[PDB]
Every structure is written in C-alpha cells, then in structure tokens.
C-alpha cells in the first residue's frame, strides 16, 4: 500500500539494507512519490558516501523524484550534479522532460564559447559529459528519421562538427533533388537565427563544398551561399 516501509528501510543501519531500499524506491518512483520526498535529503547523503557501488543509482533515483514533484529544474540539476546515468534518461520516453532542460541549458553556454575558439567541446568548462548528452540527442533524431530535428538544435548550440556530419550524410544521393531541399531550409534559417559573424562564416563554407561536390545541384542554391558570405574565394 504505503511507502512508509521503504522510508524506514533507508534509515535503519547496516549497509545492505540501505542498498536494498534504493532498488525498492526505483520500482514505484513514478507511481508513488508523495511520501518519498520527505526523505529526499537523505537520499542525497548516500550518494556522497563512496561505500555503496550503488551511489550512481542513488543519484539517479532522487532525480526521478524531483521531476515527479513538478520541479523539472531541480531534477536535471541533481542529475548533472552527480554526472552519473544520464544515458538511461535520454532514451526514456516518459521523461524526455529533464533531458529537454539539459539540452536547453547546454546550447546557451556552447554559443558563448564558440566566438572565442571554434572547438571548445573538450575544454575544461564544457564538461565532456555535456558533449555526450548532446550527441545522444542527435542519434534519437535520426531514429525517428527526421533530420530537421537534428539540424535545428545543433545550429542553436554553435556546433560546427555536428552540422558538417549531417550535410555529409546527405551525400548518399538517395535522390539528388531531395537532398537540395533540406540544405536550402538551413541557409534561409541561418540568416535569422545566427547573428554571430564567426559561427556564420564557418557554416557557409562547409555547405559550399558539399553542394559543389554534386555537379547535379542547382546553382541558385550555390549562388545564395556565395552572396551571403560575400567571399571572393567562394
């Protein structure tokens, strides 16, 4: 019935019992969470301690409870505080909510440091964990087989590599006309979304060569690149 047993099993001493409650909470975490938020601070203390090999599991559980309360912001932060088991969350259907929050946070910071150096993805401030969550999103997009999804999130975060990969994959030549349309949607959308000179330059240069490689593409779309960047070399 109630959660009251579960709460008690944590507080009671000896390692084994504490370890056991974590698994128990996880089973009913979505169903029942009202009573378990009482003991939210305690769950956090078990993570700090290194004796449990299920510390990672302890951070994972608390984060589901925050999300459920209604506190989406509290959830993602806790999840990223630990930097443990975001992989599970990314591919979980019911909570793609806190994932959205992590994505929304990352793209802003990523934009700032792009101006400074084009690659900054493995820099100390932009934790490699953040880079990993982001690429997991890109794979989810192509699984639903929409590539607009994958493009649009990456333009916001000033990612040069991910965009380059996308344009390159459309060199399959599934059909030539059909490849051009997707490319044209991004060049119009660049004008408006991107205001940063450095990032804007870099992306148009890439797009020139991928188009240029197909001798079969319209030169209206190639013209459009030449004029925007307004480069004498292109």
């Amino acid at each position: 019935t109630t959660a009251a047993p579960l709460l008690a099993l944590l507080r009671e001493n000896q390692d084994s019992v504490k370890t056991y409650a974590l698994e128990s909470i996880n089973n009913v975490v979505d169903q029942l969470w009202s009573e378990i938020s009482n003991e939210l601070p305690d769950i956090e203390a078990l993570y700090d301690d290194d004796t449990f090999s299920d510390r990672e599991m302890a951070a994972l559980i608390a984060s589901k409870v925050y999300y459920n309360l209604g506190e989406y912001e509290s959830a993602v932060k806790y999840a990223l505080a630990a930097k443990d088991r975001f992989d599970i969350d990314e591919k979980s259907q019911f909570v793609e909510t806190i994932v959205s929050k992590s994505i929304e946070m990352y793209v802003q910071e990523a934009s700032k440091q792009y101006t400074k150096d084009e690659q900054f993805y493995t820099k100390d401030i932009i934790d490699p964990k953040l880079t990993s969550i982001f690429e997991r999103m890109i794979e989810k997009c192509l699984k639903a087989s929409e590539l607009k999804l994958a493009l649009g999130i990456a333009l916001e975060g000033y990612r040069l590599d991910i965009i380059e990969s996308a344009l390159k994959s459309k060199l399959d030549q599934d059909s030539t006309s059909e490849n051009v349309k997707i490319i044209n949607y991004l060049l119009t959308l660049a004008i408006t979304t991107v205001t940063n000179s450095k990032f804007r330059s870099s992306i148009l240069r890439k797009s020139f060569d991928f188009l240029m490689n197909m001798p079969n593409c319209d030169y209206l779309t190639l013209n459009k690149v030449v004029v925007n960047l307004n480069d004498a070399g292109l």
Binding site: T1, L7, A8, R11, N13, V17
Partner: protein, 266 residues
C-alpha cells in the same frame, strides 16, 4: 535462524538477541521479498507473512530496552500497512496493541501535539471496537490532561503508570522533564518573583537541589532564597533584536509609504 531470534528475546538473555540482530537484518531483505507487502492476497504469502512480522515485532520491543528510538519507529513503520490492508487473516497480534501504545508515548515526549493527532488519525478507524481501548488508553488520557492544562492530573497518572508498567517507564521519565519546562515558560508572563517554596511546589520538584539546578539553566540567580526571572526576559529581547530577516517584519514608516507610492505608480 528466524525462530532463534524470536525466542532469544523471550528467553530473557538479550545479549544473544542483540548480537544476532544485524545478521537477521540481512535476512530481513529475503523475507520482505517473499511477500508483495499484501498488494495481492495469496495463501502462499500467508505462511511467509507470519515469519516476516516475527522478526520486526521482537526487534521493535528490543529497540526500547536498548534505548534505540530510531529503530523502534522503523520496525513499527513496516508493520503498519500489513495490519491496515485487508479483511482479516492476521492482520492483528498480541504485540500490536503494545507496540502502537509505545509509539504514541514517544511522540508526546517530543512535545508535539500535532504529530500525536496525525498518528492517532491513522489508527483511529481500526481501533474503534476492533481492538477496543484498554492499553492504548494510557497515552490518550495523558494528552488529554495536558491539553486541558491540568498538569497536576498528568503527573499523578505518570507515577501510577509504573503500577501498570508495560515498558511505560522509558517515556515516563522524559515526559516529567517536559512538564517542568512547560510551566516554567508560562510563569514568566505571570510574575517575576516566586518564593523558594513556590517554585518547588508548582514544578513538582521533590528536593530543593532540583530547584536551584533548574534556575541556573534558565539564567535566574537565586539570591536570598528568591528567584529573579527579571534577568533572562530582558536579555532574550536584546539577542532577538540581532537577526537578519528583519526590516520587513517590523515594517519601518519610511517602508510603508514607499510600497503604497509604487503601488499607485505601477
């Protein structure tokens, strides 16, 4: 194993029961997994249940004798839903009336009126005539008298509880210190001075040693056999004035005007 723990308590040699209690706490995981915490009733689970509870109950009584309040609350906590769910199949115990009474007693020693009510409501329906009121009655009578504010009455029953002892003693002592604190707090507002004899009488001190000890802890000197509440009251106001929350709590005249002006100029 399990039957070894149950009988170790009843043996009266608790040394063996105490030292064996953490190994069986590893085994308590195993027992809990047999049952579905009565979410689906099966007679497979009826047999498992007996022995799950058996460990929790003997251990719940043990936490009191070793003064481990934390642990008593936990054992009972697990127990509660097994008794709550379902039309009878045990789902009752001889140990049940006892363990519930001690819990209640514990909340009173914390001096929490509300929490006592909260706990009561959980039980209330299932004790009305199913378990009736006859041992469960001891903490209800005590709350009642203190609510009324008849401390005389409360104190008498506490003493008489030791002639109807059922491990009542462990919460008796705590709740006696509680009585004295409560009255002391009240009597600040009433007057500043009590004759030495009046302090001893009111707060139910049995010796003048207890009286002069308590006065020191309340920051009252005893000069010429007379207390002197005058001291601490003024000193407490002084300390309170130093905090940071605070500007909005008193509300300055300057503050009051400024709020109304921007209320208008929004």
């Amino acid at each position: 194993l399990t039957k070894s723990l149950s009988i170790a308590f009843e043996n009266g040699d608790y040394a063996a029961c105490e030292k064996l209690l953490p190994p069986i706490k590893i085994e308590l995981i195993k027992n809990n997994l047999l049952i579905p915490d009565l979410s689906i009733q099966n007679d497979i689970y009826l047999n498992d249940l007996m022995i799950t509870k058996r460990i929790l109950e003997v251990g719940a009584l043990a936490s009191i004798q070793t003064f481990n309040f934390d642990s008593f609350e936990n054992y009972f906590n697990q127990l509660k839903p097994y008794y709550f769910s379902n039309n009878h199949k045990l789902s009752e115990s001889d140990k049940k009336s006892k363990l519930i009474s001690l819990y209640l007693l514990n909340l009173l020693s914390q001096n929490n009126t509300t929490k006592f009510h909260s706990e009561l409501q959980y039980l209330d329906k299932h004790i009305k005539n199913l378990e009736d009121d006859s041992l469960l009655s001891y903490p209800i009578k005590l709350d009642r008298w203190l609510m009324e504010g008849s401390y005389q009455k409360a104190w008498d029953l506490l003493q008489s509880g030791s002639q109807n002892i059922s491990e009542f003693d462990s919460f008796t002592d705590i709740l006696k210190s509680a009585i004295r604190d409560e009255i002391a707090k009240n009597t600040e507002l009433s007057y500043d001075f009590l004759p030495l004899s009046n302090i001893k009488a009111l707060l139910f001190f049995n010796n003048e040693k207890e009286t002069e000890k308590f006065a020191l802890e309340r920051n009252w000197p005893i000069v010429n056999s007379k207390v002197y509440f005058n001291n601490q009251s003024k000193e407490k106001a002084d300390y309170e004035d130093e905090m940071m929350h605070e500007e909005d709590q008193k509300t300055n005249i300057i503050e009051k005007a400024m709020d109304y002006a921007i209320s208008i100029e929004n």
